[PDB]
Design an enzyme around this catalytic site. Structure first.
Site, PDB file in Angstrom:
ATOM      1  N   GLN C  15       0.818  -1.212   0.000  1.00 57.20           N
ATOM      2  CA  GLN C  15       0.000   0.000   0.000  1.00 57.20           C
ATOM      3  C   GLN C  15       0.849   1.259   0.000  1.00 57.20           C
ATOM      4  OE1 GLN C  15      -2.834  -0.736   3.181  1.00 57.20           O
ATOM      5  NE2 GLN C  15      -4.235  -1.589   1.664  1.00 57.20           N
ATOM      6  N   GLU C  71      -0.876 -13.057   0.646  1.00 56.14           N
ATOM      7  CA  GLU C  71      -2.331 -12.939   0.574  1.00 56.14           C
ATOM      8  C   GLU C  71      -2.671 -12.270  -0.762  1.00 56.14           C
ATOM      9  OE1 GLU C  71      -3.867  -9.881   3.173  1.00 56.14           O
ATOM     10  OE2 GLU C  71      -5.959 -10.415   2.796  1.00 56.14           O
ATOM     11  N   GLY C 144       3.512 -10.495   9.664  1.00 56.20           N
ATOM     12  CA  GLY C 144       4.204 -11.771   9.539  1.00 56.20           C
ATOM     13  C   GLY C 144       4.978 -11.870   8.239  1.00 56.20           C
ATOM     14  N   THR C 145       4.396 -11.340   7.132  1.00 52.25           N
ATOM     15  CA  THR C 145       5.058 -11.280   5.824  1.00 52.25           C
ATOM     16  C   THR C 145       6.099 -10.146   5.865  1.00 52.25           C
ATOM     17  OG1 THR C 145       3.037 -12.105   4.747  1.00 52.25           O
ATOM     18  CG2 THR C 145       4.662 -11.007   3.313  1.00 52.25           C
ATOM     19  N   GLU C 254      26.040   6.384  -2.162  1.00 55.41           N
ATOM     20  CA  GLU C 254      26.171   7.729  -1.582  1.00 55.41           C
ATOM     21  C   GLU C 254      25.364   7.854  -0.297  1.00 55.41           C
ATOM     22  OE1 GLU C 254      26.187  11.438  -3.434  1.00 55.41           O
ATOM     23  OE2 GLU C 254      27.264  10.785  -5.244  1.00 55.41           O
TER      24      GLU C 254
HETATM   25  N1  LIG Z   1       1.542   3.089   7.507  1.00 58.54           N
HETATM   26  C1  LIG Z   1       1.022   1.900   7.208  1.00 58.54           C
HETATM   27  N2  LIG Z   1       1.117   0.901   8.084  1.00 58.54           N
HETATM   28  C2  LIG Z   1       0.479  -0.209   7.667  1.00 58.54           C
HETATM   29  C3  LIG Z   1      -0.230  -0.394   6.500  1.00 58.54           C
HETATM   30  N3  LIG Z   1      -0.788  -1.662   6.468  1.00 58.54           N
HETATM   31  C4  LIG Z   1      -0.395  -2.214   7.591  1.00 58.54           C
HETATM   32  N4  LIG Z   1       0.380  -1.389   8.358  1.00 58.54           N
HETATM   33  C5  LIG Z   1       0.998  -1.709   9.642  1.00 58.54           C
HETATM   34  O1  LIG Z   1       1.777  -2.880   9.489  1.00 58.54           O
HETATM   35  C6  LIG Z   1       1.649  -3.712  10.663  1.00 58.54           C
HETATM   36  C7  LIG Z   1       1.050  -5.037  10.274  1.00 58.54           C
HETATM   37  O2  LIG Z   1       1.767  -5.503   9.122  1.00 58.54           O
HETATM   38  P1  LIG Z   1       0.982  -5.880   7.768  1.00 58.54           P
HETATM   39  O3  LIG Z   1       1.692  -5.202   6.605  1.00 58.54           O
HETATM   40  O4  LIG Z   1      -0.469  -5.562   7.754  1.00 58.54           O
HETATM   41  O5  LIG Z   1       1.160  -7.451   7.581  1.00 58.54           O
HETATM   42  P2  LIG Z   1       1.745  -8.341   6.403  1.00 58.54           P
HETATM   43  O6  LIG Z   1       3.094  -7.787   5.988  1.00 58.54           O
HETATM   44  O7  LIG Z   1       0.797  -8.285   5.271  1.00 58.54           O
HETATM   45  O8  LIG Z   1       1.869  -9.816   6.995  1.00 58.54           O
HETATM   46  P3  LIG Z   1       0.758 -10.920   7.292  1.00 58.54           P
HETATM   47  O9  LIG Z   1      -0.596 -10.304   7.078  1.00 58.54           O
HETATM   48  O10 LIG Z   1       0.935 -11.380   8.690  1.00 58.54           O
HETATM   49  O11 LIG Z   1       1.055 -12.093   6.313  1.00 58.54           O
HETATM   50  C8  LIG Z   1       0.845  -2.885  11.663  1.00 58.54           C
HETATM   51  O12 LIG Z   1       1.754  -2.101  12.428  1.00 58.54           O
HETATM   52  C9  LIG Z   1      -0.008  -2.009  10.746  1.00 58.54           C
HETATM   53  O13 LIG Z   1      -0.439  -0.805  11.366  1.00 58.54           O
HETATM   54  C10 LIG Z   1      -0.287   0.667   5.563  1.00 58.54           C
HETATM   55  O14 LIG Z   1      -0.835   0.654   4.465  1.00 58.54           O
HETATM   56  N5  LIG Z   1       0.378   1.791   6.006  1.00 58.54           N
HETATM   57 MG   LIG Z   2      -1.020  -9.431   5.334  1.00 55.84          MG
END
Ligand SMILES: Nc1nc2c(ncn2[C@@H]2O[C@H](COP(=O)(O)OP(=O)(O)OP(=O)(O)O)[C@@H](O)[C@H]2O)c(=O)[nH]1
Ligand SMILES: [Mg+2]
Ligand SMILES: COC(=O)[C@H](C[C@H](Cc1ccccc1)NC(=O)c1csc([C@@H](C[C@H](C(C)C)N(C)C(=O)[C@@H](NC(=O)[C@H]2CCCCN2C)C(C)C)OC(C)=O)n1)NC(=O)OCc1ccccc1
Ligand SMILES: Nc1ncnc2c1ncn2[C@@H]1O[C@H](COP(=O)(O)OP(=O)(O)CP(=O)(O)O)[C@@H](O)[C@H]1O
Ligand SMILES: Nc1nc2c(ncn2[C@@H]2O[C@H](COP(=O)(O)OP(=O)(O)O)[C@@H](O)[C@H]2O)c(=O)[nH]1
Ligand SMILES: [Ca+2]
Ligand SMILES: [Mg+2]
Ligand SMILES: [Mg+2]
EC number: 3.6.5.-
Lengths: 54, 431, 439, 346
Positions: C15, C71, C144-145, C254
């Site tokens: 995202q 996912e 987790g990812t 750099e």
């Molecule tokens: N700033 C920001 N933080 C995000 C976003 N999506 C998730 N997070 C943060 O990331 C953490 C959770 O990690 P995720 O990225 O959702 O998980 P993942 O990497 O998809 O891993 P799994 O779902 O466990 O397989 C939390 O601290 C969330 O607040 C986003 O779009 N922006």
């Molecule tokens: Mg995820």
């Protein structure tokens, strides 16, 4: 205080301003760790199925 | 998608299971035929979690109806949504289990379990990515209690890498006069401690006391008790059924709620409490939903949260409300009651807000708590069990089915260990 | 011209990757279909924007990027989004079962099944590069990812591309938007595992971004859409030197030369100003002195901490808009006599400044107002170790009772990996204190 | 209801403040490692300032200013006076001091350069190092003492001509209590104490440390005439102002407090840009104990600043309520004329 390395161009410019001067693991090692984890998962599951068989 | 397979066993299991399908089918705009007639796409975004698609955009619950007696399943076919279930998914026997756990688990249940497992395999095969199973049943009877726990163990043998979730109705003498229910319940809790990932403790003591004391129902019926159960089941599964960030699948819920493997029995809660048929004209404010959902009078498990400590909590708010106000009030609860939350698990309360409210209410909140006060419920069953077991009373019903006293002694010991384990973490401190 | 390949792992990485590529397109004048009218060399070229965008014979400017998530949901919104035509299907990689906020699932169980497919897809981008510089990895510490799969990938990238730099944009967890109780475990496990494999990492505390959105943009309860738009402006400021003509931070090496003297202490603090509300009809346009001075305010930092109670190893100012060097030197002169800015004795007290005349680009229908000048300071301060202390303390609280550890052990991890990771963080905190304190 | 944690059980001042807060019916004390607090009465060393200010929905305040150790450590106070352009060598109120390290950066060479100027200059030459103290005119004795101690000490010019109270011909030190709130308002507690020697000041023998060191601990142990002139060797400002009026035809306000207020302001204003929490994620407040010496020409000298000062028994009730009113309740207001003097500054 001292401005050095000034570089000008059409997109912008850059320089440095100084105020004062001063006073890995192998592929085999990665796979060995990853398969040791998979074997521990397999051992745990075999014990569960051994238990459920009882 | 991530499909869940639902199984409902025995009278209690099939009654609360049927009400679950009526409630969530209405929320997802699915009529008794199995056709969508809703107004929002959020209703259909995650529909394959609980429903199978079919010819002519027909949605069929991924539900399996089990009983050692035709009775309650004939009532479900005759019920309003009975027509929506897959006919081949009605697996039933002819002689019941006579509120005998040994009959459901070792003799009568043993015959019908392979037929149920065939239906489970057929539903699991057609899953893009099966997340796990959810069983509805009681622990006081024979089929839901005994056969339900046999099914849980047999399913865990074929799907060891899947989540097992249950809605277990704990018995109470206020609702039932069957003398052997503490034996059936202790034998089932032993099975649940070892084979489920998440168990919602639906206590008939709490549901009856909510109906009598709070809802002012002098003569509560099972329908009145089940009205609280279906409201709770809708609320705790909201995160699985609609688009959202928190606890969106059974595994992420287990990872957030279960810190120790055996400590996976949750105290569900609901606000506002409503009488069956009674219309609620004034909507609750966000501070009201928050205070009520954490109040002892709103718990579906007859335990006092102020007598234990919260290991983890999940709060689900439903309806159109200020997201800033729920954040403020949830912090307000934790900060003004910090003694009741284990200091060695930082930020252990997680909150989700869903825009779609449940039927009849403009705003509601569902609580799921992994509190150590749940030991009060297991202590209550354990006292009832020891009173009879101490004199070997009524045991001939079980030993007659092949069981030995040592199973009862071991079931008795495993629940006492569960209580002492909950006490261990209640008394643990950050130093 | 040397290429840079961006890799977005997990929901947070994906995202944030969308917000960045959308913004890069608006800055470079690339349309959603990949067409760039201003680019007169069709099918190729070695312009500055070509470090991030390859070119097809049909004039499509394709990001040098790979999105990976265990996912489908999040990447499916890229496949069908407004910039769906911008990426080849081979760049968007998904699994079916996610890592369930568990480092062990992402690194071992689920991750192992997709790692070779991901490196294969990365090699297809690497083979289009005449002189691959290295990678930019976007991920969360909490997921987790984001935690487990990234550390696996970083280890494999060190093996497959030994002489290539690896930068990170890591999302440090904040409970106001966190979705798992075990995020401290995932954060300490990934930091330990990735430490030797990352050359420079820019942590972004979601708490800091969340508070900037509430305070400066007047957003009641910020969403990831609100956070990611602000994050993408800071990421764009940092990569602007790779995508535009200039002399400061023209290549990835750099960044470590200018910002990282000690290899382990490779976490620069980014501070960005001005962040102003679009709803605000009238706003006094801030001066160079005003925006530069705001770089020394903890309220405008990406990680909330106090640099006065630490030491600097390297400071660096990145301006965008109506800025001349005379204004920056005057601002720095007035700031030195007002703020507490102490450098380590082995470094010169000074700033490396870069200016780009194009002011910041704002996505239409956004929260940030258009501004005549903006700055992003990157400073290697030992005060960022406060972020490690906070996370290490939460890890300590749970690990003392082994709370949730069974989920990791069940996926093949050992308790020794937890203590091994925590000893490395205890060593890292000690390194920071040795450098930045005297008593 | 407000919440607070107590992480320094040995703090007599903050033991009373916690006692007072609970007695209001609007404050609640949590277990020391509970992070959901509004106020922290923190530990004396290694206080976790990195962890304060990160708890949503809680305004967090602490009873210490991070970085105030620069003013309160003896070696740090010397380096701060010398290297701060604000204090400068236009600092006529801090005795001549040098940071000396044991022979195991250092200003040991410049100490001997200024010492030999006073030797051939025929002027007074007694000094003092940092119980655990040595007063002597031989530089060799002082330097050999610090080498044997092993810890970093400071060589200060000993005030050879102190103001002596009569009757008794005694040396003394003034303890002033200063409270700096979250808004950096400097508050001088109107009550101070004179920690007096109970023996006459002997200009000849310095080894008799009891007439030269006016600390309360050395007086109750090694003093021969303890409590004869004043209870607990503590003369308060009502009596001291009267003594100055009767003997010296001046007031405590004019002769001494204008100098004390100047020194307090200069010291705390100098470090403000380093320790101020004006725009921080958490706010700080702190109680300080400034110690002063008055020379025979009614000139005030600064001996040291204490970051964790203790109060006089007679005054704990009044000062501790002022800490609650001014520093705590200003941030956390309770439901339904001043013991402090605000030292004005801009
Ligand atoms: N700033 C920001 N933080 C995000 C976003 N999506 C998730 N997070 C943060 O990331 C953490 C959770 O990690 P995720 O990225 O959702 O998980 P993942 O990497 O998809 O891993 P799994 O779902 O466990 O397989 C939390 O601290 C969330 O607040 C986003 O779009 N922006
Ligand atoms: Mg995820
Ligand atoms: C047209 O009927 C309806 O609409 C309702 C049908 C449901 C269907 C159903 C749901 C779930 C399970 C089975 C059936 N029926 C009920 O809701 C229902 C059937 S029996 C029943 C009963 C339950 C009571 C407990 C307390 C919840 N219960 C067992 C009793 O009240 C009995 N007393 C005891 O067991 C006491 C005796 C003294 C010692 C302590 N014991 C606990 C009593 C029946 C003897 O509740 C009632 C009120 O019957 N619920 N509803 C419907 O059919 O209700 C039955 C009914 C209600 C009122 C009048 C006549 C019949
Ligand atoms: N330069 C000097 N000239 C004259 N007297 C001095 C002096 N330095 C110290 N003294 C005397 O020695 C006493 C102790 O000095 P100092 O205050 O540095 O010790 P200390 O820090 O161990 C006790 P506290 O912190 O409670 O004041 C002082 O109260 C003062 O009476
Ligand atoms: N809340 C609730 N409890 C029920 C219901 N039906 C039965 N019970 C309880 O379940 C227990 C008896 O188990 P039951 O399910 O009837 O037996 P089974 O058919 O052999 O599984 C007792 O504790 C009953 O009070 C119901 O619909 N709702
Ligand atoms: Ca080109
Ligand atoms: Mg029955
Ligand atoms: Mg002292």
């Amino acid at each position: 205080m001292e401005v050095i390395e000034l570089n000008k161009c059409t997109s912008g410019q850059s320089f440095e301003v100084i105020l004062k001067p001063p006073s890995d693991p192998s592929l085999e090692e990665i796979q060995k760790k990853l398969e040791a984890a998979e074997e521990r998962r397999k051992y745990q599951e075999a014990e569960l199925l051994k238990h459920l068989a009882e | 998608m991530r499909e869940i397979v639902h199984i409902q066993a025995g009278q209690c299991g099939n009654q609360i299971g049927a009400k679950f399908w009526e409630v969530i089918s209405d929320e997802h705009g699915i009529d008794p035929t199995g056709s969508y007639h809703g107004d929002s796409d959020l209703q259909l975004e995650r529909i394959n979690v609980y429903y199978n698609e079919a010819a002519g955009n027909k949605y069929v619950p991924r539900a399996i109806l089990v009983d050692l007696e035709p009775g309650t399943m004939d009532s479900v076919r005759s019920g309003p949504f009975g027509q929506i279930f897959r006919p081949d998914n009605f697996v039933f026997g002819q002689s019941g289990a006579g509120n005998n756990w040994a009959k459901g688990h070792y003799t009568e249940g043993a015959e019908l379990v392979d037929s149920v497992l065939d239906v489970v395999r057929k539903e699991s095969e057609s899953c893009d990515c099966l997340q796990g199973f959810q069983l509805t049943h009681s622990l006081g009877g024979g089929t839901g209690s005994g056969m339900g726990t046999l099914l849980i163990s047999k399913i865990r043998e074929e799907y060891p890498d899947r989540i097992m979730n249950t809605f277990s109705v704990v018995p109470s003498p206020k609702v039932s006069d069957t003398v052997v229910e503490p034996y059936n319940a202790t034998l089932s809790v032993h099975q649940l401690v070892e084979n489920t990932d998440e168990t919602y403790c639906i206590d008939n003591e709490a549901l009856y006391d909510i109906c009598f004391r709070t809802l002012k129902l002098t003569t509560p019926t099972y329908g009145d008790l089940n009205h609280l159960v279906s409201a709770t089941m809708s609320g705790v599964t909201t995160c699985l059924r609609f688009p959202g960030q928190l606890n969106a699948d059974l595994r992420k819920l287990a990872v957030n709620m279960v810190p120790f493997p055996r400590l996976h029995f949750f105290m569900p809660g609901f606000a506002p409490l409503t009488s069956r048929g009674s219309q609620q004209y004034r909507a609750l404010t966000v501070p009201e939903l928050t205070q009520q959902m954490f109040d002892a009078k709103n718990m579906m498990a007859a335990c006092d949260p102020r007598h234990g400590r919260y290991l983890t909590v999940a709060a689900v708010f439903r309806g159109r409300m200020s997201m800033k106000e729920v954040d403020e009030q949830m912090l307000n609860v934790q900060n003004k009651n910090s003694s009741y939350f284990v200091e060695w698990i930082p930020n252990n309360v997680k909150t989700a807000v869903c825009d779609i409210p449940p039927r009849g209410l403009k705003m509601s909140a569902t609580f799921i708590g992994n509190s150590t006060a749940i030991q009060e419920l297991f202590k209550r069953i354990s006292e009832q069990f020891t009173a009879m077991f101490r004199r070997k009373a009524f045991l001939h019903w079980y030993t007659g089915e092949g069981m030995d006293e040592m199973e009862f002694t071991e079931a008795e010991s495993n629940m006492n260990d569960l209580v002492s384990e909950y006490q261990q973490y209640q008394d643990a401190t950050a130093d | 011209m040397r290429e840079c390949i961006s890799i977005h792992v997990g929901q947070a990485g994906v995202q944030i990757g969308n917000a960045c590529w959308e913004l890069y397109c608006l800055e470079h004048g690339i349309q959603p279909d990949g067409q760039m009218p201003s680019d007169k060399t069709i099918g190729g070229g070695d312009d500055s924007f070509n470090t991030f965008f390859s070119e097809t014979g049909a004039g499509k400017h394709v990001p040098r990027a790979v999105f990976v998530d265990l996912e489908p949901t999040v990447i499916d919104e890229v496949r069908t989004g407004t910039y769906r035509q911008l990426f080849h299907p081979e760049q968007l990689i998904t699994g079916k079962e996610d890592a369930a906020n568990n480092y062990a699932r992402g690194h071992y169980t689920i991750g192992k099944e997709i790692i070779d497919l991901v490196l294969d897809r990365i090699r297809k981008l690497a083979d289009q590069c005449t002189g691959l510089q290295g990678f930019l990895v976007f991920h969360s510490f909490g997921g987790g990812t984001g935690s487990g799969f990234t550390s696996l990938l970083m280890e494999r990238l060190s093996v497959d591309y030994g002489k290539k730099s690896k930068l990170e944009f890591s999302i440090y967890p904040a409970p106001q938007v966190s979705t798992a109780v075990v995020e401290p475990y995932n954060s300490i496990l990934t930091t330990h595992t990735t430490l030797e494999h990352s050359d420079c990492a820019f942590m972004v505390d979601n708490e800091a971004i969340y508070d900037i959105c509430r305070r400066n943009l007047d957003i009641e309860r910020p969403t990831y859409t609100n956070l990611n738009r602000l994050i993408s402006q800071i990421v764009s400021s940092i990569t602007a030197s790779l995508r535009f003509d200039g002399a400061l931070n023209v290549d990835l090496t750099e960044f470590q030369t200018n910002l990282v003297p000690y290899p382990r202490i490779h976490f620069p603090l980014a501070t960005y100003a001005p962040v102003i509300s679009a709803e605000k009809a009238y706003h006094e346009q801030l001066s160079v002195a005003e925006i530069t001075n705001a770089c020394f305010e903890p309220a405008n930092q990406m990680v909330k901490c106090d640099p006065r109670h630490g030491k600097y190893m390297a400071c660096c100012l990145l301006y965008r808009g109506d800025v001349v060097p005379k204004d920056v030197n005057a601002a720095i002169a007035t700031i030195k006599t007002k703020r507490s800015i102490q450098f380590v004795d082995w470094c010169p007290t000074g700033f490396k400044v870069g200016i780009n005349y194009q002011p910041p680009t704002v996505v239409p229908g956004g929260d940030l107002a258009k501004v005549q000048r903006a700055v992003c300071m990157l400073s290697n301060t030992t005060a960022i170790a406060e972020a490690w202390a906070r996370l290490d303390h939460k890890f300590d609280l749970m690990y003392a009772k082994r709370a949730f550890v069974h989920w990791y052990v069940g996926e093949g991890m050992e308790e020794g990996e937890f203590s091994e990771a925590r000893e490395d963080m205890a060593a890292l905190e000690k390194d920071y204190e040795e450098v930045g304190v005297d008593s | 209801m407000y919440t607070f944690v107590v992480r320094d059980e040995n703090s007599s001042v903050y033991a009373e403040v916690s006692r007072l807060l609970l007695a209001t019916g609007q404050w609640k004390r949590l277990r020391k490692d509970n992070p959901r607090f509004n106020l922290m009465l923190g530990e004396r060393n290694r206080l976790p300032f990195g962890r304060l200010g990160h708890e949503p929905g809680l305004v967090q305040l602490v009873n210490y200013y991070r970085g105030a150790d620069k003013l309160c450590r003896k070696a740090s106070l010397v380096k701060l006076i010398k290297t701060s352009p604000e204090l400068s060598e236009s600092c006529t109120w801090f005795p001549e001091s040098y940071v000396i390290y044991p022979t195991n950066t250092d200003e040991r060479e410049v100490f001997l350069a200024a010492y030999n100027r006073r030797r051939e200059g025929r002027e007074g030459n007694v000094w003092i190092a940092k119980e655990g103290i040595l007063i002597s005119s031989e530089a060799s004795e002082l330097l050999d003492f610090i080498d044997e101690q092993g810890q970093v000490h400071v060589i200060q010019k000993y005030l050879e001509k102190p103001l002596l109270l009569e009757p008794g011909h005694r040396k003394f030190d003034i303890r002033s209590w200063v409270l700096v709130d979250h808004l950096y308002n400097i508050y001088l507690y109107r009550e101070g104490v004179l920690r007096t020697s109970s023996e006459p000041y002997n200009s000849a023998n310095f080894q008799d440390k009891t007439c030269h060191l006016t600390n309360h601990c050395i007086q109750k142990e090694y003093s021969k005439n303890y409590g004869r002139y004043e209870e607990g060797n503590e003369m308060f400002f009502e009596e001291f102002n009267q003594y100055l009026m009767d003997a010296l035809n001046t007031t405590l306000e004019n002769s001494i407090l204008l100098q004390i207020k100047h020194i307090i302001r200069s010291c705390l204003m100098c470090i403000e840009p380093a320790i101020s929490t004006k725009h921080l994620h958490y706010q700080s407040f702190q109680l300080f104990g400034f110690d002063f010496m008055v020379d025979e020409e009614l000139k005030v000298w600064l001996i040291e600043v204490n970051g964790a000062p203790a109060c006089a028994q007679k005054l704990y009730a009044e000062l501790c309520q002022g800490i609650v009113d001014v520093a705590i309740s200003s941030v956390f207001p309770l439901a339904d004329t001043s013991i402090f003097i605000k030292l004005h500054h801009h």
